[PDB]
Amino acid sequence: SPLLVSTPLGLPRCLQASNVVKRLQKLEDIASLNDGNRAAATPGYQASVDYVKQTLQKAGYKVSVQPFPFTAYYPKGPGSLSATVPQPVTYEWEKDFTYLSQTEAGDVTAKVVPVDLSLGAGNTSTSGCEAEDFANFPAGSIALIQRGTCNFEQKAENAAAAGAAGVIIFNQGNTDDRKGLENVTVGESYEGGIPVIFATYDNGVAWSQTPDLQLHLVVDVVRKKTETYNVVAETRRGNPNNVVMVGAHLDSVFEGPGINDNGSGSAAQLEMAVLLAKALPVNKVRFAWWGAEEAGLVGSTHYVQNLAPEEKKKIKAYLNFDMIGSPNFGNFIYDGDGSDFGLQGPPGSAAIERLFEAYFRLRGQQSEGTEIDFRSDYAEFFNSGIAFGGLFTGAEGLKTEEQAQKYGGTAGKAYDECYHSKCDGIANINQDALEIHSDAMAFVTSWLSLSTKVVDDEIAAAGQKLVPR
Ligand SMILES: [Zn+2]
Ligand SMILES: [Zn+2]
Ligand SMILES: [Zn+2]
Ligand SMILES: [Zn+2]
């Protein structure tokens, strides 16, 4: 009924936790038929996107499925490295060598060719940074390259273009702290097609001075360059130049179904969008289900960074819902005004946080602020100066005794002991939390859909933009 759903009085009371739990069960079912997870570049994520899209269309929405590039990478087992010629030597995983993250897999046995080495203390090597560092590089060989100056990606792609079958990069050795193994990457953009490993400085030097040497290199990973998706919809009704946007990431980590993280935000937001289908908002409401958040906020950052300036200034507020059903929950509100932790968001954030506070106070419920640690999809909105806020029931942090007496649960335990785990299933969901944070989501969204004036007022106060007539 439009009577109810168009107001902060009607929307929370018609968004029912039992319906949200139904959608959560659907998400867990999606994960159980898709190898146990709903992660980026998996079938579980694709089914999740389809379930959201088809639900949204069934309610009358036009749905935009925004693709963006995504490189799936993970190691499958330890590497191997062996000298076959001049003499047999088996090197030691994570002591003599390690992978470059984002390497391709491979199994290569080849003569080793050092490339433009500049050894010794104080060196400023450019090994493999330029193209004719590979002058007369015999194709098929393993390129032996020293760290220095340019990105590892550039060195390895130069080696591949020069016909290397594999790349070994050893630490620079210009200081004594730069000779061991390190956590290194060839980047998400890397397109050399050949495997890349990292070795200690002393191994690199020994290899560079061994005539005839042949290395047997094995790199056991999966890597696929592919794409994943944001799902976006918005009300047909409402002012398109004063958009209220809400977002919840739809992907899980690889290790589990991600029903609290973040089925909970996704499902509550979907239920709300369905109810809002018949609403009559003053302000347009936009809903986004973000892809690849667990890989580093990739979908939300893509979406924001690719908006036309005219389009970004139509977004008056962004509301983020990421983990709102934690088993040992607290009632956490983004500290948009910096009152608790010193960092406040763009102007209007204070008003959104006070709206959330108001709702909790009127439910007779305790609440407190939580850090803007940039660990969810509001980040790119913050970087663009868009007013934002959101709700959170806690992750790997431990519940204090003060919090236990405000919110129940168990002090000294994690808010979500199944954070990023296989057990983050439908049974990890605390329904009290889910109901109150769903209601709070509904309350603040509806209020903003009727008047943005508590956000506009702080935008104006901070803005300096003086009207002369
Ligand atoms: Zn060079
Ligand atoms: Zn999350
Ligand atoms: Zn997460
Ligand atoms: Zn605050």
Numbering used by the authors: 48 to 516
Anything the authors wrote about it?
Here we investigated the aminopeptidase, P. aeruginosa aminopeptidase (PaAP) from P. aeruginosa, which is highly abundant in the biofilm matrix. PaAP is associated with biofilm development and contributes to nutrient recycling. We confirmed that post-translational processing was required for activation and PaAP is a promiscuous aminopeptidase acting on unstructured regions of peptides and proteins. PaAP contains an M28 Zn peptidase domain (residues 44–116 and 274–510) and a PA domain (residues 117–273).
As a result, we truncated the C-terminus (residues 513–531) by incorporating a C-terminal thrombin cleavage site. This allowed the selective and efficient removal of the C-terminus during purification to produce PaAP_T (a C-terminal truncated form of PaAP). We solved the structure of the truncated enzyme form lacking the final C-terminal residues, PaAP_T, to 2.35 Å, which revealed a large conformational change. Superimposition of the peptidase domains of full-length PaAP and PaAP_T demonstrates the different orientations adopted by the PA domain due to the removal of the C-terminus. The PA domain undergoes an ~40° rotational transition in comparison to the full-length PaAP (20 Å translation at its furthest point). The conformational change increases the opening between the PA and peptidase domain, causing the active site to be more accessible. The rotational swing occurs from the base of the two extended β strands that project from the peptidase domain (starting at P161 and E272). Interestingly, the modified C-terminus (thrombin cleavage site, LVPR) is fully traceable in the PaAP_T structure and binds to the PA domain of an adjacent protomer, where the C-terminus interacts directly with R189A. The interaction of the C-terminus with an adjacent PA domain aids crystal packing, the protomers are linked together, akin to a chain. PaAP_T was highly active in comparison to full-length PaAP (an increase of ~100-fold in kcat, while KM remained unchanged), suggesting the C-terminus is involved in suppressing PaAP activity, in agreement with previous studies.
